[PDB]
Amino acid sequence: NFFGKTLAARPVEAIPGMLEFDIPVHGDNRGWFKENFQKEKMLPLGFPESFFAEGKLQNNVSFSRKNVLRGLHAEPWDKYISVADGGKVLGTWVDLREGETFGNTYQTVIDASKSIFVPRGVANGFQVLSDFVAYSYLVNDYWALELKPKYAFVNYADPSLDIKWENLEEAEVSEADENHPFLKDVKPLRKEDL
Amino acid sequence: NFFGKTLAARPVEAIPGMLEFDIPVHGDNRGWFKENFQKEKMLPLGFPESFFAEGKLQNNVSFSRKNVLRGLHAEPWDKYISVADGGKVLGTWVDLREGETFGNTYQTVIDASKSIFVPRGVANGFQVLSDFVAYSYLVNDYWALELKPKYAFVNYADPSLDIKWENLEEAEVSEADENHPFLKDVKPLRKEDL
């Protein structure tokens, strides 16, 4: 369930606006290639035109080792998340938008054959499952002081979240991520904050 | 250095329009992060605004093993090339555009701390130096039949090209790449045709 998939998108019903994509990966264990993002094909599958509305683009990459656990961060921009190497992560999302889906969750394994569109307001995180992973994402806005109040964070280890991690005991977590508020102390992101 | 470089651009004087970038990579052997592409920071360094003129975007990734050698291909679109994991390649370019700089070459090692802007009509290739590499690039057009005349190819092993590959004896080359035409049989690409 890795090579040769048809390019396709599925909405995540618990988190409005999120999309999971199957990405065609061609080859085998020795090497492969993919079109990780293709704007002309992905728009008709539901990738939102609003992603492109301001003409802003940034691609970040992090290279991380097994058991690293980052999150859960709702940064004030949309994100398209992918894996660029042979690794894999347990992707994890918690909706922090005010409304009937506040606190809703989704989890899936992200590898080179699966990508995820995450709307602004949905907190993102991952735990690295493979020995290492190249985690490559696109965003549609740039850091600005005025955006600082528009972030929201929730603690990866709040046991009331409808998520589980692969290896909570051996997780390698930043000091900041250890100290994010539990869900009960998150101020839901209002329409004015998005 | 791999880590901690200042974001910078250098023109490649042998191939008009080509740019080499140093990318700041933060971390160490255990794990790191980079802004692989940040449009607002790149434009004032000389990344061409023309790349974005038609609003087209595609990200391709190839995951390849040591001694794989691919090229040399000039395609209908501009390319921004980097590496998304801990690997490295010997990047190689041959200008296939009609005029004074046809045949001109450049080579440099690409790893996650370096990227390259390759104008359409400049042939691109690489040989993998590390055990594996995640080679991730952005392009600004999509396949279409009508672009077929915008492609040119030149053989990687043509002894007249002012390039040197590693350990050619052990290179893993596709049948197609073994049979690309020699420079003297390449029809130079007209600028008005690109």
Coordinates of C-alpha atoms in Angstrom, one line a residue:
Chain A
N1 CA 0.0 0.0 0.0
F2 CA 2.7 2.4 -1.0
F3 CA 3.5 2.3 -4.8
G4 CA 1.3 2.9 -7.8
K5 CA -1.7 4.6 -6.1
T6 CA -4.1 6.7 -8.2
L7 CA -4.0 10.3 -7.4
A8 CA -7.1 11.0 -5.2
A9 CA -8.5 13.0 -2.4
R10 CA -10.7 12.2 0.6
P11 CA -12.2 14.7 3.0
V12 CA -11.7 14.1 6.7
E13 CA -15.3 14.3 7.9
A14 CA -14.4 15.1 11.5
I15 CA -12.3 18.2 10.5
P16 CA -14.0 20.4 7.9
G17 CA -11.6 21.5 5.1
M18 CA -9.0 18.9 5.7
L19 CA -8.1 16.6 2.8
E20 CA -6.1 13.4 2.6
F21 CA -4.4 12.7 -0.7
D22 CA -3.1 9.5 -2.2
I23 CA 0.0 10.3 -4.2
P24 CA 1.3 8.1 -7.0
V25 CA 4.8 6.8 -6.1
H26 CA 6.6 4.8 -8.8
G27 CA 9.5 2.4 -8.2
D28 CA 10.4 0.1 -5.3
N29 CA 12.6 -0.1 -2.2
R30 CA 15.7 0.8 -4.3
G31 CA 14.3 4.2 -5.5
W32 CA 11.2 6.0 -6.7
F33 CA 9.7 9.2 -7.9
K34 CA 6.5 11.1 -7.3
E35 CA 4.7 14.3 -8.2
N36 CA 4.2 15.4 -4.6
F37 CA 2.1 18.5 -5.6
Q38 CA 0.6 19.3 -8.9
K39 CA -1.6 22.4 -8.8
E40 CA -3.6 21.8 -12.0
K41 CA -4.5 18.2 -11.0
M42 CA -5.1 18.9 -7.3
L43 CA -7.5 21.8 -7.7
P44 CA -10.3 19.6 -9.2
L45 CA -9.8 17.1 -6.4
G46 CA -10.7 19.8 -3.9
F47 CA -7.4 21.4 -3.0
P48 CA -8.7 24.9 -2.2
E49 CA -8.1 27.8 -4.6
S50 CA -8.0 30.0 -1.5
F51 CA -4.5 28.6 -0.8
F52 CA -3.2 30.6 -3.7
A53 CA -5.2 33.8 -3.3
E54 CA -2.4 36.0 -2.0
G55 CA 0.4 34.5 -4.1
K56 CA 2.4 33.6 -1.0
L57 CA 4.5 30.4 -0.9
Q58 CA 7.0 28.8 1.5
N59 CA 8.3 25.3 1.7
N60 CA 9.8 24.1 5.0
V61 CA 11.6 20.9 5.6
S62 CA 12.5 19.2 8.8
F63 CA 14.7 16.1 9.2
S64 CA 13.9 14.2 12.4
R65 CA 14.7 11.0 14.1
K66 CA 12.6 8.1 15.5
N67 CA 10.3 9.1 18.4
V68 CA 10.6 12.8 17.9
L69 CA 7.1 14.1 18.6
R70 CA 6.2 17.7 17.5
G71 CA 3.0 19.5 18.1
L72 CA 0.2 20.3 18.5
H73 CA 0.4 23.7 16.7
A74 CA -2.3 25.6 14.9
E75 CA -0.2 28.2 13.0
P76 CA -2.0 31.0 11.3
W77 CA -1.7 29.7 7.7
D78 CA -2.8 26.7 5.6
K79 CA -0.5 23.8 5.2
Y80 CA 0.1 20.9 2.7
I81 CA 2.1 18.2 4.5
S82 CA 4.1 15.5 2.9
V83 CA 7.1 13.2 3.3
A84 CA 10.0 13.5 0.9
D85 CA 12.0 10.4 1.8
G86 CA 11.3 6.8 2.7
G87 CA 10.3 7.6 6.3
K88 CA 7.0 7.8 8.0
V89 CA 5.2 9.7 10.7
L90 CA 2.1 9.3 12.8
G91 CA 0.3 12.5 11.7
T92 CA -2.1 14.0 14.3
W93 CA -4.6 16.8 14.1
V94 CA -6.9 18.5 16.6
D95 CA -9.4 21.1 15.4
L96 CA -9.0 24.3 17.4
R97 CA -11.6 26.4 15.6
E98 CA -14.6 27.7 17.5
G99 CA -17.7 25.7 16.6
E100 CA -19.2 22.3 16.6
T101 CA -15.9 20.6 15.6
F102 CA -13.7 22.1 18.3
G103 CA -11.6 19.3 19.7
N104 CA -12.3 16.9 16.9
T105 CA -9.3 14.8 15.9
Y106 CA -7.8 12.7 13.1
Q107 CA -4.7 10.5 12.8
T108 CA -3.1 8.7 9.9
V109 CA 0.3 7.5 8.9
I110 CA 2.0 10.0 6.5
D111 CA 4.6 8.6 4.2
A112 CA 5.7 9.5 0.6
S113 CA 2.5 8.1 -0.8
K114 CA 0.1 10.2 1.4
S115 CA -0.2 14.0 1.9
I116 CA -2.5 16.1 3.9
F117 CA -4.1 19.5 3.5
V118 CA -4.6 21.2 6.9
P119 CA -6.7 24.4 7.1
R120 CA -5.6 27.3 9.2
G121 CA -7.0 26.7 12.7
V122 CA -6.4 23.0 12.9
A123 CA -3.5 22.0 15.1
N124 CA -0.8 19.8 13.5
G125 CA 1.7 17.4 14.9
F126 CA 3.5 14.2 14.3
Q127 CA 5.6 11.4 15.9
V128 CA 8.4 9.9 13.8
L129 CA 7.9 6.2 13.3
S130 CA 10.8 5.4 11.0
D131 CA 14.5 5.8 11.9
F132 CA 14.5 9.2 10.3
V133 CA 12.1 11.2 8.1
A134 CA 12.2 14.2 5.8
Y135 CA 9.0 16.1 6.5
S136 CA 8.3 18.6 3.7
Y137 CA 5.4 21.1 3.8
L138 CA 4.0 24.1 1.9
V139 CA 2.4 27.1 3.6
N140 CA 0.7 30.1 2.2
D141 CA 1.8 32.9 4.6
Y142 CA 4.9 34.2 6.3
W143 CA 5.7 34.8 9.9
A144 CA 4.7 38.4 11.1
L145 CA 4.5 39.9 14.5
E146 CA 0.8 40.7 13.9
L147 CA 0.1 37.0 13.5
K148 CA 1.5 36.0 16.8
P149 CA -1.8 36.3 18.7
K150 CA -3.5 34.1 16.1
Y151 CA -1.6 30.9 16.9
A152 CA -3.1 28.3 19.1
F153 CA -1.5 25.3 20.7
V154 CA -2.6 22.2 22.6
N155 CA -0.6 19.8 24.6
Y156 CA 0.3 16.5 22.9
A157 CA -0.1 14.7 26.2
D158 CA -3.6 15.9 27.3
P159 CA -5.2 12.5 27.9
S160 CA -8.7 13.8 27.1
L161 CA -7.8 14.3 23.4
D162 CA -9.1 11.6 21.2
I163 CA -5.6 10.6 20.0
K164 CA -2.9 8.2 20.9
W165 CA 0.8 8.3 20.2
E166 CA 3.0 5.5 19.1
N167 CA 5.5 5.8 21.9
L168 CA 4.6 8.4 24.5
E169 CA 7.2 6.9 27.0
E170 CA 10.2 7.5 24.7
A171 CA 8.9 10.6 22.9
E172 CA 11.5 13.3 22.3
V173 CA 9.7 16.6 22.8
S174 CA 10.7 20.2 23.0
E175 CA 10.3 22.2 26.2
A176 CA 7.7 24.4 24.6
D177 CA 5.7 21.4 23.5
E178 CA 5.8 19.9 27.0
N179 CA 4.1 23.1 28.3
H180 CA 1.3 23.9 25.9
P181 CA -2.1 24.2 27.5
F182 CA -4.5 21.3 27.8
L183 CA -7.6 21.6 25.6
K184 CA -9.7 22.9 28.4
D185 CA -7.4 26.0 28.5
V186 CA -7.3 26.6 24.8
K187 CA -9.3 29.7 23.6
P188 CA -11.1 28.4 20.4
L189 CA -10.0 30.3 17.3
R190 CA -12.9 32.6 16.2
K191 CA -13.7 33.6 12.6
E192 CA -11.8 36.8 13.3
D193 CA -8.7 34.8 14.3
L194 CA -8.6 32.9 11.0
Chain B
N1 CA 29.6 24.5 6.4
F2 CA 26.3 22.6 6.2
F3 CA 24.7 24.3 9.2
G4 CA 24.1 27.9 9.9
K5 CA 24.9 29.6 6.6
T6 CA 23.4 32.9 5.7
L7 CA 20.7 32.9 2.9
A8 CA 22.6 34.0 -0.2
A9 CA 22.5 33.8 -4.0
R10 CA 25.4 33.6 -6.4
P11 CA 24.9 33.7 -10.2
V12 CA 26.5 30.9 -12.2
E13 CA 28.4 33.0 -14.7
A14 CA 28.8 30.2 -17.3
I15 CA 25.0 29.7 -17.5
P16 CA 23.0 33.0 -17.7
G17 CA 20.0 33.0 -15.4
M18 CA 21.2 30.2 -13.2
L19 CA 21.5 30.9 -9.4
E20 CA 23.1 28.9 -6.6
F21 CA 21.7 29.5 -3.1
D22 CA 23.0 28.9 0.4
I23 CA 20.1 27.8 2.6
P24 CA 20.3 28.3 6.4
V25 CA 19.9 24.8 8.0
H26 CA 19.5 24.8 11.8
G27 CA 20.3 21.9 14.0
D28 CA 22.9 19.1 13.8
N29 CA 23.3 15.5 12.8
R30 CA 20.4 14.4 15.1
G31 CA 17.9 16.6 13.4
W32 CA 17.4 19.9 11.6
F33 CA 15.1 22.4 10.0
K34 CA 15.2 24.7 7.0
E35 CA 13.1 27.1 5.0
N36 CA 13.8 25.4 1.7
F37 CA 12.0 28.1 -0.2
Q38 CA 10.6 31.4 1.1
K39 CA 9.3 33.5 -1.8
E40 CA 9.4 36.9 0.0
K41 CA 13.1 36.3 1.0
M42 CA 14.1 34.9 -2.4
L43 CA 12.8 37.5 -4.8
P44 CA 15.1 40.3 -3.4
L45 CA 18.1 37.9 -3.8
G46 CA 17.4 37.6 -7.5
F47 CA 15.1 34.6 -7.7
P48 CA 13.2 35.6 -10.8
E49 CA 9.6 36.9 -10.5
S50 CA 9.0 35.4 -14.0
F51 CA 9.0 32.0 -12.3
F52 CA 5.6 32.8 -10.9
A53 CA 4.2 34.7 -13.9
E54 CA 1.7 32.0 -15.1
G55 CA 0.7 30.8 -11.6
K56 CA 1.7 27.2 -12.2
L57 CA 3.3 25.1 -9.5
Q58 CA 4.4 21.5 -9.2
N59 CA 6.7 19.7 -6.7
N60 CA 8.5 16.5 -7.8
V61 CA 10.6 14.3 -5.5
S62 CA 12.9 11.5 -6.5
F63 CA 14.4 9.2 -3.9
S64 CA 17.5 7.6 -5.3
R65 CA 20.4 5.4 -4.2
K66 CA 24.2 5.9 -4.3
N67 CA 25.7 5.9 -7.8
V68 CA 22.5 6.5 -9.6
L69 CA 23.3 9.0 -12.4
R70 CA 20.4 10.7 -14.2
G71 CA 20.5 13.3 -17.0
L72 CA 21.1 15.4 -18.9
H73 CA 17.6 16.7 -19.5
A74 CA 16.5 20.2 -20.5
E75 CA 12.7 20.5 -19.9
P76 CA 10.0 23.1 -20.8
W77 CA 10.0 24.6 -17.4
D78 CA 12.2 26.4 -14.9
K79 CA 13.3 24.4 -11.8
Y80 CA 14.3 25.1 -8.2
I81 CA 16.2 22.1 -7.0
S82 CA 17.3 21.1 -3.5
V83 CA 17.7 18.1 -1.2
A84 CA 15.1 17.3 1.5
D85 CA 17.0 14.7 3.5
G86 CA 20.6 14.2 4.7
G87 CA 21.9 13.0 1.3
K88 CA 23.9 14.7 -1.4
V89 CA 24.3 14.7 -5.2
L90 CA 26.8 16.0 -7.7
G91 CA 24.7 18.3 -9.7
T92 CA 25.6 18.9 -13.3
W93 CA 24.3 21.3 -15.8
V94 CA 24.8 21.9 -19.5
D95 CA 23.4 25.0 -21.1
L96 CA 21.4 23.8 -24.2
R97 CA 20.1 27.2 -25.3
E98 CA 21.1 28.8 -28.6
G99 CA 23.7 31.7 -28.5
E100 CA 27.3 32.1 -26.9
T101 CA 26.7 29.9 -23.7
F102 CA 25.5 26.7 -25.5
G103 CA 27.5 23.8 -24.1
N104 CA 28.6 25.7 -21.0
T105 CA 28.6 23.6 -17.9
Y106 CA 28.6 23.9 -14.2
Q107 CA 28.8 21.3 -11.5
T108 CA 28.4 21.5 -7.7
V109 CA 27.5 19.3 -4.8
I110 CA 23.9 19.8 -3.8
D111 CA 22.8 18.9 -0.2
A112 CA 20.0 20.2 2.0
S113 CA 22.1 23.4 2.6
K114 CA 22.3 24.3 -1.1
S115 CA 19.7 24.9 -3.9
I116 CA 19.9 25.8 -7.5
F117 CA 17.6 27.7 -9.9
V118 CA 17.8 26.2 -13.4
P119 CA 16.3 28.2 -16.2
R120 CA 14.3 26.3 -18.9
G121 CA 16.6 25.1 -21.6
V122 CA 19.5 24.3 -19.3
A123 CA 20.0 20.6 -19.1
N124 CA 20.0 19.1 -15.6
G125 CA 21.4 16.0 -14.1
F126 CA 22.8 14.5 -10.9
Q127 CA 24.8 11.6 -9.5
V128 CA 24.0 10.4 -6.1
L129 CA 27.0 10.5 -3.7
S130 CA 25.3 9.4 -0.4
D131 CA 23.7 6.1 0.3
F132 CA 20.3 7.7 -0.6
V133 CA 19.0 11.1 -1.3
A134 CA 15.6 12.8 -1.4
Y135 CA 15.8 15.2 -4.4
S136 CA 13.0 17.7 -4.3
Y137 CA 12.3 20.3 -6.9
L138 CA 9.7 22.9 -7.8
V139 CA 8.7 23.6 -11.4
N140 CA 6.5 26.2 -13.1
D141 CA 4.8 24.3 -15.9
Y142 CA 3.1 21.0 -16.6
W143 CA 3.4 18.4 -19.2
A144 CA 1.5 19.1 -22.4
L145 CA 1.9 17.5 -25.8
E146 CA 2.6 21.0 -27.3
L147 CA 5.7 21.4 -25.2
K148 CA 7.4 18.4 -26.8
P149 CA 9.7 20.7 -28.9
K150 CA 10.9 22.5 -25.8
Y151 CA 12.7 19.3 -24.6
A152 CA 16.4 18.7 -25.3
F153 CA 18.7 15.9 -24.0
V154 CA 22.4 15.4 -24.0
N155 CA 24.4 12.4 -23.0
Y156 CA 25.9 12.3 -19.6
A157 CA 29.1 10.5 -20.8
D158 CA 29.9 12.6 -23.8
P159 CA 33.7 13.0 -23.3
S160 CA 33.7 16.5 -24.8
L161 CA 31.5 18.0 -22.0
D162 CA 33.4 19.9 -19.5
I163 CA 32.2 17.8 -16.6
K164 CA 33.5 15.0 -14.5
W165 CA 31.4 12.4 -12.8
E166 CA 32.4 10.1 -9.9
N167 CA 33.3 6.5 -10.4
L168 CA 31.6 6.1 -13.8
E169 CA 32.4 2.4 -13.7
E170 CA 29.8 1.9 -11.0
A171 CA 27.2 4.4 -12.2
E172 CA 23.6 3.2 -12.5
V173 CA 22.2 4.7 -15.6
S174 CA 18.9 4.1 -17.4
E175 CA 18.8 2.8 -21.0
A176 CA 17.2 6.0 -22.1
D177 CA 20.0 8.1 -20.5
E178 CA 22.7 5.9 -22.1
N179 CA 21.2 6.7 -25.5
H180 CA 20.7 10.5 -25.5
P181 CA 22.3 12.2 -28.4
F182 CA 25.9 13.7 -28.4
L183 CA 26.3 17.5 -28.1
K184 CA 27.1 17.9 -31.8
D185 CA 23.7 16.2 -32.7
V186 CA 21.7 18.3 -30.2
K187 CA 19.6 21.0 -32.0
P188 CA 20.2 24.2 -29.8
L189 CA 16.9 25.5 -28.3
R190 CA 15.8 28.9 -29.6
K191 CA 14.9 31.4 -26.8
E192 CA 11.8 32.4 -28.6
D193 CA 10.7 28.7 -28.7
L194 CA 11.1 28.4 -24.9

